[PDB]
From a paper:
Thymidine kinase (TK) catalyses the transfer of the γ-phosphate of ATP to 2’-deoxythymidine (dThd) forming thymidine monophosphate (dTMP). L. major Type II TK (LmTK) has been previously shown to be important for infectivity of the parasite and therefore has potential as a drug target for anti-leishmanial therapy. The enzymes from Leishmania spp. are type II TKs with a ~100 amino acid C-terminal extension compared to those from other species. The overall structure of the LmTK catalytic domain in all three complexes shows a nearly identical fold to those of type II TKs from other species, as expected from the sequence identity of ~50% on the amino acid level.
Ap5dT was also a strong inhibitor of LmTK with an IC50 value of 1.1 μM. In the LmTK-AP5dT complex there are two chains in the AU, both with well-defined density for the dThd moiety and the five phosphates. The coordination of dThd is essentially identical to that in the LmTK-dTTP complex, with E85 in the inactive conformation. Only chain A exhibits good density for the adenosine, which is much less well ordered in Chain B. However, in Chain A, the adenosine is flipped by about 180° from the position expected from the CaTK and TmTK complexes, and lies on the surface of α/β-domain, partially covered by the poorly ordered 42–59 loop. In LmTK-AP5dT, the phosphates have different positions from those in the LmTK-dTTP and the TmTK-dThd-AppNHp complexes. The binding site for adenine expected from the CaTK and TmTK structures is again blocked by the adjacent dimer, just as in the LmTK-dThd complex. LmTK forms closed tetramers in all three complexes, which explains the lack of density for the adenine in LmTK-dThd and its unexpected position in LmTK-AP5dT. While hTK1 has the residues interacting with the ribose ring (D58) and the transition state (R60), these residues are disordered in most of the LmTK structures hinting at a more relaxed binding or might be a crystallographic artefact. However, it is ordered in the structure of LmTK:AP5dT with the side chain conformations of D58 and R60 being identical to hTK1. The LmTK-dThd and LmTK-AP5dT crystals contain two protomers per asymmetric unit, with the tetramer sitting on a crystallographic 2-fold axis, while the LmTK-dTTP asymmetric unit contains two tetramers.
Numbering used by the authors:
A (entry chain B), D (entry chain B): 3 to 43, 59 to 181
B (entry chain A), C (entry chain A): 3 to 52, 57 to 179
Amino acid sequence: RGRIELIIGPMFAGKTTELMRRVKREIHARRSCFVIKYSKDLRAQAAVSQLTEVRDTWKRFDVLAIDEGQFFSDLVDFCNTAADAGKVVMVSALDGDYRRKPFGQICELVPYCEAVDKLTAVCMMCHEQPACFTRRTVNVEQQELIGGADMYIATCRECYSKQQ
Amino acid sequence: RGRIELIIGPMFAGKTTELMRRVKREIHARRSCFVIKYSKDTRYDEHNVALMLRAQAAVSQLTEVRDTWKRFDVLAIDEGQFFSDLVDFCNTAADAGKVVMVSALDGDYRRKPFGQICELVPYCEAVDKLTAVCMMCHEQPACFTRRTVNVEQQELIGGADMYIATCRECYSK
Amino acid sequence: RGRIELIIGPMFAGKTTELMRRVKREIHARRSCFVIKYSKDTRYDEHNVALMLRAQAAVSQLTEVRDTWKRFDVLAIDEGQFFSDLVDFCNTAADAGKVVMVSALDGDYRRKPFGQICELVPYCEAVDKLTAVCMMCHEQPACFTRRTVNVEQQELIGGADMYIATCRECYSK
Amino acid sequence: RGRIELIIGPMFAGKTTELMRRVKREIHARRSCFVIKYSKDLRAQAAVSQLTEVRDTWKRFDVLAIDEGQFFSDLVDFCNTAADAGKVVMVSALDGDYRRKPFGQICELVPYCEAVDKLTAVCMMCHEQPACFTRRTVNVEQQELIGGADMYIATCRECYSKQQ
Ligand SMILES: Cc1cn([C@H]2C[C@H](O)[C@@H](COP(=O)(O)OP(=O)(O)OP(=O)(O)OP(=O)(O)OP(=O)(O)OC[C@H]3O[C@@H](n4cnc5c(N)ncnc54)[C@H](O)[C@@H]3O)O2)c(=O)[nH]c1=O
Ligand SMILES: Cc1cn([C@H]2C[C@H](O)[C@@H](COP(=O)(O)OP(=O)(O)OP(=O)(O)OP(=O)(O)OP(=O)(O)OC[C@H]3O[C@@H](n4cnc5c(N)ncnc54)[C@H](O)[C@@H]3O)O2)c(=O)[nH]c1=O
Ligand SMILES: Cc1cn([C@H]2C[C@H](O)[C@@H](COP(=O)(O)OP(=O)(O)OP(=O)(O)OP(=O)(O)OP(=O)(O)OC[C@H]3O[C@@H](n4cnc5c(N)ncnc54)[C@H](O)[C@@H]3O)O2)c(=O)[nH]c1=O
Ligand SMILES: Cc1cn([C@H]2C[C@H](O)[C@@H](COP(=O)(O)OP(=O)(O)OP(=O)(O)OP(=O)(O)OP(=O)(O)OC[C@H]3O[C@@H](n4cnc5c(N)ncnc54)[C@H](O)[C@@H]3O)O2)c(=O)[nH]c1=O
Ligand SMILES: [Zn+2]
Ligand SMILES: [Zn+2]
Ligand SMILES: [Zn+2]
Ligand SMILES: [Zn+2]
């Protein structure tokens, strides 16, 4: 029946690719899938900034796939409500922000998950080690800052701490 | 090389057994291990009977161990949910090159974050969530712990007399 | 450092997608990747439309690639069950320091070992078996592939017209 | 219902400990377990050299746990027969012998398994790397040779190939 599965890791770890692998796998067995994306960064897709913007539309689907779950403030209630109604809920997210603080409600969701898979990146500094962290490479304080390789890199533990 | 590995799941999932599997594996390669346990959980000792590269300590605060961890290659912290200084302690060790391994419940009986376990996740190179077998329906994996006695507080020491592991359907029933 | 990683499972499990996730991850760290595909499986190309550190080759024997693999950090072999020289090729590369990653069916439609996949297992640093969703009962994970047309031979190219992924109960029914 | 789960890896990887963790987990949910061991190296234990020596006794148990599965010549038929009758079958074994050849029927079982978990040891030569292989440290040819750390060590790939 219902469950919540979490796919976490740093940036550049292919978390969305693993989410969509799980989605495609379900589509092959003719189960219907609703993919929800973050608007500011047998298949339907929606882009929103709050999960309430989707209303009741999720009820018609067997599987819900939430991408970049760190940005949704109502994630926990939304996922449990769906999983309680028998949906397979899958979330892709960063567990940590650039300071390794809990990003959004991701760490809060952990106790509700039937499964949690932490994916690694490859360290983009030493090229020699798995990366579990994200370092911000530009001097901006704010937690939410949208960007890719131009402003963030994945790092191992030794390279995260190099300099500051 | 320094790292933190987290072993989580509900009660009855064999988390300590997995922690000690990782410890025995390191001992075979002659790396030294420091096992730290929570002194107030006395179930094992009060109803059960008694290596060269292994040390064991039982404490209620991780500061009670001071610097002794520095002499060991590997630190293995059991029932990590009960230690308030877990995050700072694990990072300080991992940054000094220790392999830190923690066994803990991620969730309490209400599925609220237990201690600093959920806070540690962003610091971990690895996170393995283990399942139990649901002790109500017997036919589903269990990811949650239900408290079977009517006590509100979060810390309450006990085993199968006071808790059972459950699937999602049986947690809410 | 050299290694072999094996990605197995039944059909419809997204094995190639996981292989390419591992490839894209390496490309982000500017390590170069050589993707090798089986030339006779033309399903993707015959019904579908068309990076700097990536190369792709389509062959029926791994010798058709000669030495070209030596210039790459990572080798990604897709549908490995069809290559007869897989074991020797993967070890030679891994021993020369390549990260070798193979996606393959471990079992054919009779659950017999497909090609040299089962033979490779003892050489692998890692083995991940992926599940599909059972295409018969829709409510169980699938670990097997059933052939839905009456053909005996082992190699028979096709997709969902000719095969479905099944749980254990639905494989035998 | 029925399934076959395989726990493989080199020596010194704690494979039997992971097998027994799965057994203990089942016992907590009052499911009954039959542990079968290799005689030459809610719970019952048997030590045998052939799985036929157990006859029909396995039928009374919910869960079967076969240790050192590499030594049983009838493993595949035995596991499928049980899993087909609705047993949870769990096997702990070496997938490779000291030359990295398939040990017994372990590699043959893979296509029948719902799950396969390969555990690592820590390399007992360089102490610095995970070990996936077993090296024999005494000059004996024969495949079956019972022993522990006195005659075998776990190694990474680089240390397996050191010298010969
Ligand atoms: C550290 C930090 C980050 N962020 C911001 C910066 C970023 O804008 C975003 C990353 O958040 P995420 O890591 O959850 O987002 P994803 O991009 O989903 O993470 P991935 O691991 O998926 O990224 P990769 O770079 O590995 O993805 P890759 O596959 O290499 O890149 C292709 C791009 O296309 C998308 N994509 C990939 N496969 C797709 C598919 N099958 N269908 C649809 N879209 C797909 C991906 O989302 C990615 O952006 O959040 C902050 O605001 N604060 C912070 O402190
Ligand atoms: C849900 C909830 C629980 N609790 C309390 C209740 C308990 O006092 C404690 C459990 O915390 P845990 O689940 O982190 O503790 P463990 O017992 O470590 O978890 P396990 O997953 O290991 O438990 P099992 O019951 O599966 O362990 P098992 O092997 O069955 O039992 C034997 C006991 O012996 C120890 N043990 C087992 N194998 C061992 C080995 N190889 N070496 C040394 N010791 C070993 C284990 O610690 C276990 O408690 O926390 C709360 O206070 N509030 C709550 O909301
Ligand atoms: C059981 C059996 C099968 N076969 C034959 C039938 C087939 O011809 C082939 C399947 O062999 P595979 O299962 O190893 O082949 P894949 O297609 O590689 O397995 P997947 O698990 O990847 O299949 P999916 O169906 O889940 O893949 P999907 O994503 O759904 O489909 C899209 C196709 O595009 C490719 N693709 C998917 N993502 C891609 C990406 N990111 N980049 C490049 N290519 C990508 C994939 O190869 C897939 O075939 O072998 C036999 O000959 N005998 C037998 O007994
Ligand atoms: C490479 C090679 C090996 N062998 C032989 C040599 C050996 O005699 C045997 C190892 O075969 P295995 O690796 O399947 O056997 P296990 O010992 O089951 O492997 P483990 O990974 O479990 O061993 P470890 O050394 O990590 O186990 P450890 O936990 O450190 O050691 C304690 C011992 O007690 C047993 N044990 C451990 N936990 C137990 C529990 N909970 N209940 C009962 N017994 C338990 C274990 O089997 C081990 O022998 O096979 C060959 O004949 N030919 C070869 O080419
Ligand atoms: Zn690095
Ligand atoms: Zn249940
Ligand atoms: Zn089915
Ligand atoms: Zn080594």
